[PDB]
Each structure stands twice: as structure tokens, then as C-alpha cells.
Amino acid sequence: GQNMRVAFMPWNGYNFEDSILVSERVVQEDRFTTIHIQELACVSRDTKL
Amino acid sequence: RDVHPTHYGRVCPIETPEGPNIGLINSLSVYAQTNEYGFLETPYRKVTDG
Amino acid sequence: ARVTVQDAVEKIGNRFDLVLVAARRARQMQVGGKDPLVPEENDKTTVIALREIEEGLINNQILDVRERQEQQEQEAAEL
Amino acid sequence: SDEADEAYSVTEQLTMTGINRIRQKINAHGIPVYLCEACGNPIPEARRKIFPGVTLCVECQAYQERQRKHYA
Amino acid sequence: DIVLNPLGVPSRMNIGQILETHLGMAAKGIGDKINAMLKQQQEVAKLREFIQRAYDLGADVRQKVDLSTFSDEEVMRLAENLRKGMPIATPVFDGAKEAEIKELLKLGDLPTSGQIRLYDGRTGEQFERPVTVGYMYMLKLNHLVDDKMHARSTGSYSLVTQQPLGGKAQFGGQRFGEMEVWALEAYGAAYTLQEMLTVKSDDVNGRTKMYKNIVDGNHQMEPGMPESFNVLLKEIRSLGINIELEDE
Amino acid sequence: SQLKLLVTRGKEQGYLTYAEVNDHLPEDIVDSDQIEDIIQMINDMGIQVMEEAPDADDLMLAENTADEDAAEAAAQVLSSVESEIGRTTDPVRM
Amino acid sequence: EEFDAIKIALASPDMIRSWSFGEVKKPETINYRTFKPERDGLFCARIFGPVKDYECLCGKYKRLKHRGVICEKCGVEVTQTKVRRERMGHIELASPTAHIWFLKSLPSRIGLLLDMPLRDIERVLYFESYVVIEGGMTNLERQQILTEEQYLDALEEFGDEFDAKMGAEAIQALLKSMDLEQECEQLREELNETNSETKRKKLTKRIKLLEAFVQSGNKPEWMILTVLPVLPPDLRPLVPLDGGRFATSDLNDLYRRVINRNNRLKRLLDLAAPDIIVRNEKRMLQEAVDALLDNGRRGRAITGSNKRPLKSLADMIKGKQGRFRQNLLGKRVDYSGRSVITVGPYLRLHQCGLPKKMALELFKPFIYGKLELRGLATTIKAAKKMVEREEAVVWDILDEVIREHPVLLNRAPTLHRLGIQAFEPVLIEGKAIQLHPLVCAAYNADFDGDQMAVHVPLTLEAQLEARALMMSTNNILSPANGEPIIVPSQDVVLGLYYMTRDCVNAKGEGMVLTGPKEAERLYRSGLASLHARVKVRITEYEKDANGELVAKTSLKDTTVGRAILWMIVPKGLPYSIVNQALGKKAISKMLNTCYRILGLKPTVIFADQIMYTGFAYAARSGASVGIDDMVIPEKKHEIISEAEAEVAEIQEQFQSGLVTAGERYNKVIDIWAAANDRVSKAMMDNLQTETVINRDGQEEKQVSFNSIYMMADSGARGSAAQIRQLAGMRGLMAKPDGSIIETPITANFREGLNVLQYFISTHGARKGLADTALKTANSGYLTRRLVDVAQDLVVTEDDCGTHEGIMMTPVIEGGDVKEPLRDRVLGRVTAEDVLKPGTADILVPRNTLLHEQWCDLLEENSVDAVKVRSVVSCDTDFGVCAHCYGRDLARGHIINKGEAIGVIAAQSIGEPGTQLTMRTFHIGSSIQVKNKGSIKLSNVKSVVNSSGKLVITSRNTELKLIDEFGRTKESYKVPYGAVLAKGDGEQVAGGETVANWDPHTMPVITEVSGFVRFTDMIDGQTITRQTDELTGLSSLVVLDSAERTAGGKDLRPALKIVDAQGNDVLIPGTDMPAQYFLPGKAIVQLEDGVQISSGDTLARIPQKDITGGLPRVADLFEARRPKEPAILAEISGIVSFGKETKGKRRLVITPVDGSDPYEEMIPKWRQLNVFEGERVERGDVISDGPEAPHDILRLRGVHAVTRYIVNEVQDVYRLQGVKINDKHIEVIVRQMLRKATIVNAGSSDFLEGEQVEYSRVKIANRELEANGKVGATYSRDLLGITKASLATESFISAASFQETTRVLTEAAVAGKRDELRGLKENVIVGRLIPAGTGYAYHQDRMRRRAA
Ligand SMILES: [Mg+2]
Ligand SMILES: [Zn+2]
Ligand SMILES: [Zn+2]
Ligand SMILES: [Zn+2]
């Protein structure tokens, strides 16, 4: 992962039980913007019809 | 499912997937190898007299 | 638009007959049976039924009295 | 809670019950005995000082612990 | 950036992350000092004395670097790859003893306590009692939300038992198992349960009559009888067992 | 009769083992089909194991089913199968 | 289709033909070129209907008008294709064949129906041995089997008038040829003549069986199949998978095998092969059919082309994947979803967040209806294209469908009935179900990725139930005790505990404020800290008047913190609730007092306000944790040096031979744990009061603001143990064996842990994991087992109308009162009226719901016991009346009519069971009164000795502690004859000893004071030459049996008491003269020659672990008799001995005059704690040890055993510190002791020694004795839950959780017309549950029926 400037303090309970509260400067830069690649198949079978 | 006092250097004590099967999925330690006959074997430094 | 029903369960006890009475009343207001007796707060018919239960102006007895009244109003419109 | 915290409470229970079992085994209270309760031999007063209320000698104590190793 | 929860450390003995936060804070301290020394661009002698201070640093180690061997056009490269923050190491059970971290924070200019006064960002007034800060290294486990999310209004259906069986992201209902039924029996909820396992789920006429009624804006449910129990009659009867339904 | 002693031990001890049953069994049959039948009978008896391992903890702990009117017939089938003769099993062997 | 009870019975052959639609004949299934079905095989068209809806097979007729006409070319009835799913065809088995269930069920149905052992049946079936079938009357018994050669001879014996077969033909001949009325008459005959209780026992048992099998509609030969039905085609499909590969079920395979073997047998018969051939073929067909039905009980399954045994018809019903457990209870559900839950504090607690996209996928039908209503799409397809474009207006229409429509939100395991709560929705960007925060404690859900599922209630009754019963703000009281389950958990309480504390010198010291309002105006502007002690003018509203609220201004002396917390507290509460520290316990009893005073609405809105202000000031605290926060004690290195020197002491002393290895190990572990506790205390006192600051003067110390200390003090997280491990040393890791390692961890987490120490930690860490892995996978076994037994139980009467409850008092276990009376009579309703100690009154009517007002009165008047009505003595038939269950519920009013209390009871007992150690777990001579208060003795039998002191001559005198109030403040159990000091009902002083006795040795102290001699004390025979021979103590002590002669065993060891001449004075009251006899080991000291004093030790006779796990609760409800059963009296009368030592010595007890002869056999390896000359009361401790609950139930009575079980399992919980109200355990007990036994039937028609259940026999004798006739005596039973659930009026229920096969077959032979009206039953058959809302509906059907 990537290192990012954390600070330990409750702050209105948007991290109540075990939660995290990421600030939009983390989401703008694309520094967790991770990439996923899929393999969609579309076969063409040989029906009796 | 448990750790026995001879895992020291042959199986990670703190790596095993918690949940259904803990301890059954031990991870081979860092420096450790497989013996000739097949056992696990770790390194040590031979100490002479002192 | 209503956090609880606790006034309703006070008025018409048993907390289950409440559910049944309110459901019947709601089918009346939703399917074209009737219209509400409490000023609607643009709420769905469920809340309006619980509320009319809350005022002591719907219950099992009153609903059966109106069943009787509409059954007898029809036989004088069938002739 | 979490799958770690439950494990913490269980481990604390396990070590607590162990430690209390081994504090209960040590006597540290009783009346002086002056002689073995099995063979009649004398308990030397140094050993009695180490444990107030030693019902056994060291010989009989070792013997009893040694039979009890086989857990019978 | 991230604002974790302090109530998670004392309950879980993993004070490791707090030591890591302080050490990372100090490491970015070295990084920003190099950043200023490079961006106010000084001369390679300044960077040599400073980075060479950052690598010697006190207690005995197995690391000594001797930056008087690098050329100028290497120490400049080295500084540029360090300006983001001086990567500190810590072999596992031979870690950074806390005095070493306090000194590596003094080498920066952070507060040796490890904590900073944080001004709130909405009310603009100082959070009492200086909070922790620092750079924690945070992964991203692949339990992403848009792989777990799922919702099924009316998908495909199984073949032997007419139950919801959809595929895509198990494109079917949630397993409304047994203990949930004990829950819904514990309430007085009887109609919700009934439409939970007669209309919504199995009864292959009840479900389409339900759907037609929903689209017509008439929330009833003409339930009928499940399909699973019907299969159970046909099986229990395939044996030599006359199962019936008395009619009265 | 000793297999009836296996029965009473399975009643008291709360389980058995392959070694226990294989100890008490009536000698000279050992086809391993009669054995599988008799082990299924001891399972259908009060004993509900048949074991390999003795225990067993909080994981499904303290389990039991009374199953009255099955014990008296199962133990009867045991005492009859031992005393009279060893019955054949399956039909290829028939 | 509101049919009836379901009915089951044998499958008569012509019935099996009426089920048919044409005989299957051939093993083909499909046609390998055109995948139409071959006719006629397992599949067909003409048999089981058409393939394509309304289309023939050959294709002549293909229109809806032609429905019904069977095509002349291939006879396929053109009809729907779902008719392919309901048609059963049959097979014509050439030779008959035995149904495996009615052969190998365990107790053979045919065995105990023919009066024949099983091995002979297997003989006749598998052709082992011939057998007679009505062999006439020449020589042979009817059942008399034969063998080969014997039949060969007998054909020469009686070739005529003879009848012997073998095979299924034989069993069928026997069963048919049987005549059941004949056997009933014969069995009643031998019940008449054969007077042998074992004999006529089994005789009358078999006659019970035959009369049952006659009173069904059955016939005995229907157990042997001639015609065997095939399952339809679409329950065992042959689906075309992609690629030509077909994926068929297994029944096609089995039926193919059976049809092959039937056809082959018919083919053999046409040829008339030799008898070995036809015999092996019939055996093959027998095995084939027996593998079709069960594929087990036959010895070895016939696995398919896999190596995996192929499933069969008795196996598609059974198991946790059969239709019962896997598709009749756990069924998938349309209109559901799920996601990652999240935090979302901006919500009132009655609305869960929810994504826009899950909403627009759950509510498509609602959207479509609304969109064809507002004319935004004329046809439904247009509306679909719209909402699939996600256009502008479907979000508006979705917000108009999601106005008042409650979604049900579930978590993965739903233990307790708060596990499934509904909410309203609030449409949200994103994909996390933003749950509320407070409710997470209820779900038991942190936010580490846990996934809750949302359902949707379709109908209108279900919406009113997801609002009026399952809404979030109607379940805040936990079902297992009245305390709210909306306890603020971790950031909220830290926020308050930081808010309402006081540092000694902050800004704004001492300045007075005009109220709370300018307390906030000071804090926000910054002129004064959040906490600095300050006079204000609060105004609390106490409501002592009848519903009034009397204002009362004042100047409380508080901080600013408490005051700014005060603007949120609603009216009725008093200000002394928020003036303290406001930890977690106090901040939860804040909500508790709010609910107990102001009802529900202000408590809900107040819990929300608390969470809001808690989060706000918890964020303002900046309550961060940093590495300077964990302070090590500077006196740690000394303590560790000191203990590591004490181990040097024990090492030196071990290698001097003074202590064994075990002793040095124990002593080492003792000094390390001591060092551990000392270091932990030193850190905690360097940590708590550590902060020292200074008000306008020198210095002063206060509780600290060390962030970790507030996090450990509030109750937010952790405690002193985790604070130990972070700062002080961390103990002694315990290796998973259970044995504790002796090498402690002298380091801690602020310091490092070198390699050995961390590694040793690994043992206990991984044991914790390997147990909380087995606990999460076996978490609901106890709730499962309880709702199996306690399910069909519904509060179905308003008032049972009785006066018989159980007496409640505060438990006191020889010390400070554990559980007071306001926690036990809080909700239950009184049984008989309550009188203030002068009676003075009628304090409370007998039917007063004891809410907290009445507990107020009871605690103002100091009432000690309140005979309160209880679930286990309600007089209702199939139910539990309204009152006697009491009131407890998520609500606070009396329990409604119908609300299914069995389930919520089992869950109240089973959800805290998650909060208990899963492994079992063992915790391990003078009386000392605590304080002022008089003495109180019960069952005290004292003698006024000539010595002066007091001694009790009753075995069971309890030493209580009463005050001048009259309350029972303390109670102690005196052993026999303890030396007593003070008076009986008199006054004593606090903390003063009042009773002493002999610790291990039993006195035999005399009755009155008279002269002494001896009888039957001859040394060598009855006595031995004992003496403390350095002192002269002639002790001719009673000889035991192994030292008394065989006539000595006939001797009577004795102590005679002579009067002043040589006679024996009568014992006072009785006429047994003055003497005491004694057993073996009745060690005598003095002899003949002294006058005794009351309190003479005439002899010297020598001589608790509480398991606390969950398995202790499992075994409590299982009611297993313990190992050492507490031997207990049987008849209230005098005691004596019996036939001396026949291995087990025999006691003998005798009443005044009645049925005396009871003697009991006892293992004489165990003490007998009874005198040899006393009158043991019925239900009295002859011996010690745990006493079996069955003996409680049979000796004492119901209420005794119920108080036993509730106090025992309450011990098991309140050991661990878990609250659970006793209604729930009492109702599970009322389900335990349901069955009954009979003593004398008399004017009823039940068999005497038969077992029948209590409700049935009780209504029987209630209506009979209501007549002029006489009742029927019944001895109550008590079953474990696993056996008390094992009997059920229904079989559809007992086919779920019991093993299905035994249930089905027993019901089948019995022809048991199972009604509905359970809950398993109706949840299976999918009509209204008769528990909750469905109860009025079932009353409707009850009225319909019977009229
Ligand atoms: Mg979790
Ligand atoms: Zn000795
Ligand atoms: Zn045709
Ligand atoms: Zn009652």
C-alpha cells in the first residue's frame, strides 16, 4: 500500500467501532485508484436447432 | 492446531489463517529448509569453546 | 413520519390486534375503499392507519360498525 | 467485537485459571507438623520455614508427586 | 489525511502501530528537511552533511554509509529519491529502540513527544490535548464494496426446487435461514415471515400474483402453499407412505 | 456375553473405539461386512460414536438422544447374532 | 386450499395405482438423437404429461383449445407442463419385495408385528431359510422356520396339507394370513393368566401395539410392496447442460436399475430358470429396491460412477440438506440484498442509511407501479427502460416509494430477536449500508467489514409489522432483562467522560453561571474550559406528584461540563444523575432511569441526543493516544530484581534437597505472580493519581488525564489488565496444555519483547484463536436445542385463575446478599396478597403487576418474601396464561396474548451464552456474623446443657441473620451440634462470632443429662483396644464389619445411658429408652463410669467446585444425574439400618405407623450422614454430593426442583457476570417437566405404569373429578430437553429435528392424523404462524371448525 498522513483522534464518530475516515485529498490523487481486469467470455455453441 | 516448542525456526508461530482451520496451514519460516530425509531444519552458528 | 406506535398500543392494547386493525384500515385507504379521517401528512397509508388508531377513531369495533353500515347501505341501493 | 478480542479474553481466562490452580497448591498456611504425615520421619525446620504447614517430608513429597506424574 | 480511532489501541495490545506512527513522522521530517534543502537548492555540501547526519545517527548499527564516496551527480539523485521521506528500516526483533526514534525526531524539527496540536478544520479552534500524527503505511484489502454489494428483486429460479438462484453476484436472495425464522417468530411477526418464505421465495403462483399486485399498487399477498412442501409430499409419497391432506 | 460387556461399557463410558469393539467382538467371523453391520447396530444402539478419537469438547458438547425402544431391540439383535451363528451379508456372496 | 391437518398412513397398493398415470416399463430415458423422451421409461410423455406447454409429443395438437384431448398417435394428454411435476407412475414388481423401512427401522415393524426375531426374517427374505405359512395342524408352528434339508424331508413328511414358502411371498403370506383380532384376544388371555410382571409387561406391550395397528386404518400386509411408485420426471430431472453433457439426478439411475431387474426377473420367469437363478434375481431386486428407498441399513451403499454414494429417496428428505431443514426452513428470498455496513452518525436511531442503487434494485416493482400511476410511462416496458436508464425522475419516484417503507436489516448470525431489526430507509450515495451506531451493540457488529443484509416487506400487514413490532425504536429493552440495550459504547462514552470531569485549576474557576445556556456560551467562546468546577443555577424537574413535574430552582455545585451535558437531559430526571463522572456504567443507568421514569419516547430521543453530544465532545477532546502516554513504573526494575532473587532462593534450596521439583516450581510461579501484581499496582498508582497540579497555592493531586487512563476508566475499552500489559510486565504465558510456563515475561509492550518472550506468548495467543474459531462455528447449538423443546408454547389465556406460585426471596450464600428482591419480583405477578409485618393492611392485591412502583412500596416496608405467580405452575392447557408469565418483554407492559414466549425465552437463555467460556471451567470452621442484627434459627433442635453453651440437635438448622426490620440480612448453615453461644431470635453485636463446632469430626452429644454404661461392647467383637496410650484414654472403639466376627456382624455396637440405678429413662417425648447406638468407626473415648453433660463428644466421626462454562448450562438443562448422587430420604420417619453389608449396606427408615418397610441399598464406600437413631424427614440429606434433579422432583415437589434449576443456572451466569431474567429459565423448565406418570388410573382409562404427559391427564381428571367421579394419581416426571423435545403431538415437526426416518415410520404405522397448530408445522407447510399476529387468524379457524 501507500503511506499517508494519519492522525489518531475520534472526530465525530465517523470512525466508531473500527472505522477509518479518509479525506478527499486521498481520493483525488488516485493513490488508491486500483485497477481490475476481467475476462468476459461469449462462446458460440452448436445447438440442434 | 497448536504450536509446540520445536517450531522455533521451522514454522511461523504468528502466520496461520484464522477462522475454520487455524494451525493446520503453518507457513514455512524464513531461513528454514527441508532435511535430507524430509524433516525441517534451521540454521545455527557453531560455537566452539567460547 | 412516526418513530413509534406506543400511543397506539396504549389506546388499542395487545400490540398485535394493533397490527391487524391497522392493516385492515390501510387496505381500506389504499385500495379504493375509503379515505383518511386524519389530515394526511403525505404519508403512506400505513402511517395514516397507525395514526387513526392513535386518535381512538379507528379500532376493531368501529371498523365492524362501518362494515355493517356499508353492507346495509348497499341493499338499499340494490333494491 | 473482533476475532482477536474474544481470543484475548479466552487466553486471559486460561492463564488466570492456571495461575490460581498453582497458587492454591502452595500452602503457606497451617499448623506446624514436626514430622512426616506418611512415614513419621521429622521435617527439618528449615523446610518447614520455607513452607508453613508442610504435611510431608521431602522424600514422601517427592514420592507422592512421582506417583502422581502418571496421573493415577 | 486519515483519522483513525484511538480507542482501538489500548484495547488491542498492538502499540506497534503507534511506534510506527512516530517513526514515520520523524522519517518524513528528514524527508521534508531534504526537500527544503533541495528546493531552496543549496549546494551538494549541505546535502552531504545533512544526509550523512541522517545515516550515522547515534547508536551502533550495521549501516554506515560514508557519503564522501558518492559523486555530486549521485547524491543529488539520492536526495531526489529521498525527498518524499527518508525510508527508515527496522529488522523485526532488532527494532528501533525509542530513544533512537526520539533522536531521529530531533534530527528533524518535530516535537519529541511525537504529538502535535491539531487545529480542527471546521470550527477552526485548537483540539485540546495535543493529538498524534505521523505517516502510517496503509494497505487496501480487496474486500471492495462493489464486489460484495448485491440486490435481487426478481432474478432467475432454480429447477428442482423453485428457489431464487441467480449467479452473477450470487444473483439471488440472502439465505433466510433457520435462526432468522426464530427471530421472526420471536416478534409477533407472522405475515412478514409468511411472505418471507411463501410469496417472496417459493410458491410459483404466489410470487407472480404478488408481482402483479405490487405493480398494480395493491399490497396484498394471496399466498397459497410453498413449492418445497409440495416436493416433500411427492417424495414422502414416492416411498411406501400415503401422505395426504384431510379436507374440512 | 462379553459383547454385552461392550454394550454396558458403551452405555457407561459414553463412547467406544475401533479398538474397543474390535476387542470385544465374537471371534472367527471377521468378514468386515458383518463387522460393518454390527458397528451400525451399535451406532443404532445407545452408543452413538463409533469413535476413533475419544473426545470431543464444547464442539458439539454433551450430545445425546434417548431413543428408547431401539436399545432393547438392538442389544437383542447383538446377543442373538453372536449366540446362534454368523449370518451372511450382501447378495453376491449369497 | 386451507385444507386441514395432514394425514399419513401405509401406502395401500390400489391406492398406489390411483396415484398412477400408467406403468413405467422400460429403462430408457431419452433418445440420444432427438432429446425428446422415449416411451415409456423413467420419463415419458403419455405417463407423466407433455414436455412443452400445450403441445403434443409428435405434434398433432398445438393449441390451447385442444387442452384435454389425448393425441391418438402418442396418447399424450395435451396439458400444461407443470403437470409433468405432479404425476406419479408405478411399477409392477413381479415378485413382491419388502419395504426396507418396515424391515430395518431398528425395532423391526415386521419383527414385533409378527412376534418374530429379525435374523429369521432376513433368512426368509434373502432365501437363507424356508418358513411355514399356515402349515395347517399336523406338526409345525406357524412362525416355525426351517432350512433346506428340513423342508425337503417335510415334503416327504407332509407333502399334503402343508404350506411353506420363502422370499417376500412368505412374509406377505404371514402378514396377510395373520388376523389381528385373534391376537388381541390371545394377548388379553395371557394378560389374564400369565401373572408375571415382566411377562405380562411385554405381553400387554405387544397388545398395545396390535390394538394400535388395528385402530389405524391399516392392514398388516401393506408393508410388503407389490407396486412401487416412481417419483415424477421433474423432481429428478435430466437437464441439458451446455455441450451435450447432461447433468441428471441420481434417482434416474436407481429407477433404471430397479426397472432393469424387474424386467429381467419377468424374463427369467418366462423361461423358468433353475431356482438358483430366480433366487439370485429376486435377491438382486430386493437389494435394488432397498437401495432405492434408503441406500443404507442394507450394509453397503451402491455408489454411482463416482466413488461417492448415490443419494436416494430416504435421503432427499433427511439431513441438513433434505427438504425439511434445507429447503423448508432455509430458503433464498427475493427482494433482498447485502453490503458492507458502515458508521453513519448523522442518523436518528430509527433510520438506517441505504444506497441509491440497492434501493433502486429492491423496489423495482414499487417504482413500476408508481410510474404507471403518474403517467411517466404508459406501459410497463417503458417504465422499465426508464428506471434502467437511471433517469432524473425515477430518483424522485424512488424517494416517494421510500417514504415510510421499512427495510429489515439482518446480520449474518441472528442469535437473539434483536438480531433482525427493521429501520426506515434514507437514500444514500455509495454502496455501504450506513447503519446507525447505537444499534451495533445489539447486532453485535463492529465495522471491520461485516455485512448486513436488507430484506423488504412486500405486503401491508408486513409493513405494519415492520413498523409496530420490529422498528428500531421499539426494541431498546433487551429481551433477556429490562435494562436498555442502547448502551452508548465507545467514542460516545469517552466523549462524555472527558466532558463531565473536573481538572482542578482550569479557566473560569468558581465563577457562577446563570444556567446551562451561558455555560455553553462560555465554553464555545473560550472564556472557560469545558471542565472547571463552577456554581450554576440548574433547574431540575422532579415528578413526585401524581404525574406532575414540580420545578425547583437551586444552585447545584458543578462544573461547566456537567451543565452543558444538562441541556440535553429531558425533564423528569433529577440533576444528581449528571453531576458525577459519567463513566460507562453510570451513562447507561442514565438511560435506564430515563426509561424507568419517562416512558419510551423521551428515552429514545434522549439516547439520540446523548450519542450526538457524545460524538461532538469526544471529537473536541482530541483524545489521542501517544507513546509517552504509557508510563512505566520507575519501581519496576527493583521489583523484578527482587523476585528474580527470590527465585535464586528457591533454586539454592532446591539444590539443597529441601523441596521437590514440584514445590520449587509452584513457589517460583507464586513469587512471579506476586511480583506481577505488585508491578501492576505500582504502575496503576503511577498512572491514576499521577497528574499533580496546583490551584493558586502549593500543589494537589487528582485523577489523571493520561489518555490511556481515560480510555481505561470510562469503560470505553480495556481495563486494568490491558493497561498492565501495555506498561507493567505481562504475566506468565500459559502453554496450551493448561500448565503455566514458569519463565515470565519481564518485559512489556512499551519496551520490546526479545525472541523467546514473544514466542512463549504465541502459545496462549494461538489457543485463544483456536477456541474462538470453534466458538464462532458452533455458536448457536444451545439456542437450537432449547427452541426445539420450548417452541410450541404461546401465551394463550388472559388469566389461568390460580393461587399457587413460587416464593421469592433474596438469595444469600452465607454472606453479602447476592441478588436482592427487587431484581426478582420485578415483573412477576403476586400469587397471594402481601401483608405488612403486622398484617396491618392488605398491602398489594394478588393480581398486581409488580412494576417499579410496587417494588418501591415493597422496599419501603421491608418485605422479605413475595409469593409470586410463576410460569411453571400455570394451569393452562397447551399454553401459558397471560399474567403468570409476568410482564417482561422488550416493552414494559404485561405480555400480550399470543406473543411466542418459548422462542424469546430460549433466545434470552442463548444469546448471552455467546458471552460465556465455551470450555468448562472450575473455580475451586466457625460462623462470623457481619453486623448488627438479631439471630434467626430454622429447624433448630437445641438442648439447654448443664454447661451453658448451646448445641443444635437437628441436622438442618440454618443460622440466619435478622434485624429489627425483620428482613433476612444473612444466613449460615450450622453443622450438627455446633457449639452455639447466643440466643434463638435474640440480639447480637456486629462482626462477632456466635457459633463454633468441630471442623472434621462429628459430635454425638447426648440428649439429656444422665448416668452412663455400655452394652454389647466386647473387645474383639464390637470394640477395639484404642487409647491415646501416653494419656490413659481407654478407648474401646466400635469395630467395623471387616473386624467384627460373622456373629459380630450380628452384634449391635451400643452406648447405653443408665439412670441413677441401672434402668434407662425414656427419651423425652418418645419411649425409646436413654441410650445411643453407634455404627462402625464410632470412635469412643470415655467409658462406663461418668455422668454425661449435654454436649458430650461421646464419639469422634470424620468427614463445591462450580463449573462455570456454557457446558455446565447444557448439562443442567440435560438434567443428567451427576456422578455421586446425593442419597436422600424417602419417607418422613425414624431411621434404622438393614441387612448388614451385602456389598451395599441397606438403610431402613420408618414412619410413625404407616408404610414403614422402605430399606435402601447404599455403596458403603461412601459416608452416611445420618444418625442411627433419628427421624429423617422426607427429602432430607442422608448423604452429601450433588443431588439428582429427578430426586428433587419426586421427593420434594415441583417448585423445589424449579428453584433448584433456576438458582443453579443463575449461578452459572452471574458467576461470569451476565444478567438473564428467570422467566426464561422457568419457561424452559415448564417445557422440561411436561410428561407424567401414573400411580392408580382408577376412574380414568390410562394404563397404570404408562407414561403420559401432564396436560392430557390433567384435563382428563379435571373434567372427571368435575363430574361425580374420582381422579387419577400421577407422579410427575422430568426429562432432559434433548428427550423432553423428543415427544411431539405432530409428526411434521418431529420429522424436522429428530431423525426423520424413525419419525415417519412410527407415525406411518400408527396412522397419526397430525394436526397443524405448532410452529415448526406451519412454518413448514407455509400458512400463518399461530404465534404472533397469526394467533387471531388461528382463533378464526378454531371458530370455523367445531361449528
Ligand atoms: Mg466483525
Ligand atoms: Zn516424611
Ligand atoms: Zn401425438
Ligand atoms: Zn399461569
Numbering used by the authors:
A (entry chain I): 797 to 845
B (entry chain I): 548 to 597
C (entry chain K): 2 to 80
D (entry chain M): 2 to 73
E (entry chain I): 1095 to 1342
F (entry chain L): 7 to 100
G (entry chain J): 15 to 938, 948 to 1126, 1132 to 1375
From the paper:
In Escherichia coli (Eco), the essential primary σ factor, σ70, binds to RNAP to form the σ70-holoenzyme (Eσ70) that is capable of recognizing and initiating at promoters for most genes. Upon locating the promoter, Eσ70 melts a ~ 13 bp segment of DNA to form the open promoter complex (RPo) in which the DNA template strand (t-strand) is loaded into the RNAP active site, exposing the transcription start site. Although only half the length of DksA, TraR regulates Eco transcription by binding to the RNAP secondary channel and mimicking the combined effects of ppGpp and DksA. To help understand TraR regulation and principles of the regulation of transcription initiation in general, we used single particle cryo-electron microscopy (cryo-EM) to examine structures of Eσ70 alone, Eσ70 bound to TraR (TraR-Eσ70), and Eσ70 bound to a promoter inhibited by TraR [rpsT P2; Gopalkrishnan et al., 2017].
Analysis of the cryo-EM data for the TraR-Eσ70 complex gave rise to three distinct conformational classes. The three TraR-Eσ70 structures differ from each other only in the disposition of Si3. The first class [TraR-Eσ70(I)] contained approximately 41% of the particles and resolved to a nominal resolution of 3.7 Å. In TraR-Eσ70(I) and TraR-Eσ70(II), Si3 is in two distinct positions with respect to the RNAP, while in TraR-Eσ70(III) Si3 is disordered. Si3 in the TraR-Eσ70(I) structure [Si3(I)] interacts primarily with the β’shelf (SBHMa) and the β’jaw (SBHMb) in a manner seen in many previous Eco RNAP X-ray and cryo-EM structures. The TraR-Eσ70 structures show TraR binding in the secondary channel of the RNAP, consistent with the TraR-Eσ70 model and crystal structure. TraRN extends from the RNAP active site out through the RNAP secondary channel to the β’rim-helices (at the entrance to the RNAP secondary channel), interacting with key RNAP structural elements surrounding the active site, including the -NADFDGD- motif that chelates the active site Mg2+, the F-loop, and the bridge-helix. The N-terminal tip of TraRN (TraR residue S2) is only 4.3 Å from the active site Mg2+. TraR binding induces a ~ 18° rotation of the RNAP βlobe-Si1 domains (the two domains move together as a rigid body), shifting the βlobe-Si1 towards TraR, allowing the βlobe-Si1 to establish an interface with TraRG and TraRC (615 Å2 interface area). TraR causes the BH to kink towards the t-strand DNA, similar to BH kinks observed previously, resulting in a steric clash with the normal position of the t-strand nucleotide at +2.
